[PDB]
């Protein structure tokens, strides 16, 4: 039994080809995993609180309070794009391919090992290690999804990239049900804001505990475990951003006079006056038909209220945004109209020699141009008396109730009849692959997280924990402290994923931006003499296309 090992170790990228533009991108990967024995034992419910910060006046949310159930188990999981792909391999996908389709996913675990630590006292101490055959490892994997769900990166504690370096899973946890309400506050607020907790509604409680649900293959080690392949169900994603904004929807007006000399300050003429132009329009009184005012088949994007926190069971939380900041060059900070900004560390950047610790941060803009730029928006009466007098219209400079930061733009919305937008572009390699789809019946039209969504059910996760041991002592069903033999165990892990894509084709006269090395990043790709690594972010949606 022990005298064999059944596994293989693969990180490869192989391009198999078919007829007529359909190309299977088949990527594999693997990692080495080390796993501490969980120090706790029983399932554990905890409520976290920090209030001096919500106590002091102001501080809308610098934090809230949550309650979770911490299992001893731990989660090895896929669903990053740094687990399988390489910024070397990533190139040939995004330059040649206009679309993706998802197919199939599978995992297996092979050649487990279990070790042991015996800590001497009178010795220095030195740590003895004797490989233990008869100890055991637990593997619990469900394809039913019944037990509750998370992906992981809302943080990116996910498996480390590169396949020479080990990586660790993370302890597994999920939200419980409480109630909280929090009243506003600011610097000038007097009295008390009345911040209170609020127990738990007993009507609704979920303790979900996998040992009450899903089987568990147990392993001493010669043995392997393999999950069969569970397919996906999805819709494709476009790799090609849409530049045309509400200006480019239509046929442009006809110039009646064409300019002359080469070199430019040279401006053509619309050739008619503003009064006599001919065309369709929507407006209160038109002797005016402009490049601006005119009927367009529909809008693009939506103006959304930004930084508005609606209250609920958890009270304060942020209301997300589905668009990019494209067209707005003057508002940055981090992600002004919203540009999801990843913060990770020590594991996929902030080059791998970093003394102490400190997070890593980059604002990821959109490469899609849909203008939501709030500045330069206002409203008129229906009379259209031009030039307009200050008393008959609005500006972003006008308060609400006598305030300043608010313009009017913080309270607005449209979205309704004519709007549309493009599915959120995938990001890399801190992003996410697939996402489970909501349980209710109205099925939001997208997610500001994942590119792809299983419309039926997504494949599950892989849970693992060391098997317990006792020496001699015990009490039955006791939350007192039972002694233990400190151990740990390593197991290799493999993964496979299947893609389908189509080659794009030129039909333009122009070349198109690609990713490539230069001297801007000269070496962001090549290791540092201590072994340094980064894998800087890279923006992929590179391909402009027609829209309407």
């Amino acid at each position, epitope marked *: 039994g022990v005298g064999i090992s059944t596994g293989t170790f693969n990180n490869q990228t192989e391009f198999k080809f078919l007829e007529n533009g359909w190309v299977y991108i088949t990527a594999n990967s693997s990692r080495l995993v080390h796993l501490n024995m969980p120090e706790s034992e029983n399932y554990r419910r905890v409520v976290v609180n920090n209030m001096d910060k919500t106590a002091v006046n102001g501080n809308m949310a610098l934090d809230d309070i949550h309650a979770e159930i911490v299992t001893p188990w731990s989660l090895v999981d896929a669903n990053a794009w740094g687990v399988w792909f390489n910024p070397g391999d990533w190139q040939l996908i995004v330059n040649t391919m206009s679309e993706l389709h998802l197919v199939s996913f599978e995992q297996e675990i092979f050649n487990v090992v279990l070790k042991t630590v015996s800590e001497s006292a009178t010795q220095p101490p030195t740590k003895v290690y004797n490989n233990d055959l008869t100890a055991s490892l637990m593997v619990a994997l469900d394809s039913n999804n019944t037990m509750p769900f998370t992906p992981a990166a809302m943080r990116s504690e996910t498996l480390g990239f590169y396949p020479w370096k080990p990586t660790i899973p993370t302890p597994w946890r999920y939200y419980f049900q409480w109630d909280r309400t929090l009243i506003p506050s600011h610097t000038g607020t007097s009295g008390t804001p009345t911040n209170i907790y609020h127990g738990t509604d007993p009507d609704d409680v979920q303790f979900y505990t996998i040992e009450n649900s899903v089987p568990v293959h147990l392993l001493r080690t010669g043995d392997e475990f393999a999950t069969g392949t569970f397919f996906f169900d999805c819709k494709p994603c476009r790799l090609t951003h849409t530049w045309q904004t509400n200006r480019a929807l239509g046929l442009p007006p006809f110039l009646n006079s064409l300019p002359q000399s080469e070199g430019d300050t040279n401006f053509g003429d619309i050739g008619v006056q503003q009064d006599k132009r001919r065309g369709v329009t929507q407006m209160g009184n038109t002797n005016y038909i402009t490049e601006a005012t005119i009927m367009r088949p529909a809008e693009v994007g939506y103006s959304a209220p930004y930084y508005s926190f609606e209250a609920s069971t958890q009270g304060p939380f942020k209301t997300p945004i589905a668009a990019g900041r494209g067209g707005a060059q003057t508002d940055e900070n981090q992600a002004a109209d919203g540009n999801p900004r990843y913060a990770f560390g020590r594991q996929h950047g902030q080059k791998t020699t970093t003394t102490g610790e400190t997070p890593e941060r980059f604002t990821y803009i959109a490469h899609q141009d849909t203008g939501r730029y709030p500045e330069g928006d206002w409203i008129q009466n229906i009379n259209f008396n031009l030039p307009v007098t200050n008393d008959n219209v609005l500006l972003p400079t006008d308060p609400i109730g006598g305030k300043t930061g608010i313009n009017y733009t913080n309270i607005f919305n449209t979205y309704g009849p004519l709007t549309a937008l493009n599915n959120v572009p995938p990001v890399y390699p801190n992003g996410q692959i697939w996402d489970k789809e909501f349980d209710t019946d109205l099925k939001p039209r997208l997610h500001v997280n994942a590119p792809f969504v299983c419309q039926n059910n997504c494949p599950g996760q892989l849970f693992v924990k060391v098997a317990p041991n006792l020496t001699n002592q015990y009490d039955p069903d006791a939350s007192a402290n039972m002694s233990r033999i400190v151990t740990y165990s390593d197991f290799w892990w493999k993964g496979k994923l299947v893609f389908k894509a189509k080659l794009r084709a030129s039909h333009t006269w122009n070349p198109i931006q690609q990713m490539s090395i230069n*001297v*801007d*990043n*000269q*070496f*962001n790709y090549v290791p540092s*003499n201590i072994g340094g690594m980064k894998i*800087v972010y890279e923006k992929s949606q590179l391909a402009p296309r027609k829209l309407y």
Partner: nanobody
Amino acid sequence: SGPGLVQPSQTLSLTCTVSGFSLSSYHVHWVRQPPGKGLEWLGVMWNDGDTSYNLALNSRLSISRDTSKSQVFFKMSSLQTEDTATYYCARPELPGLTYGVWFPYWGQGTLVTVS
């Protein structure tokens, strides 16, 4: 850089335009006190570099726009000042190894950055 405390962001930029030989890569931001010190002379990023105290990292593209960054925060509680940033900018080192060495000219006298 600063101003002023304890570790705010950015405000080091000069000089445009024609900032020197683009050799991959170059200096000089002047550097430093002037009585010191300093600053073991930038590489190019993944991995080429770098400076002598952590979080001193530098980055920029030598193509146009020819610029610089950050720089940087870093640890300023020592009240030190180099507020410019002007070029020619001899041989960096890394390239170098003549042996070394030498540094012709500079530009744009005193800019002082507060503690």
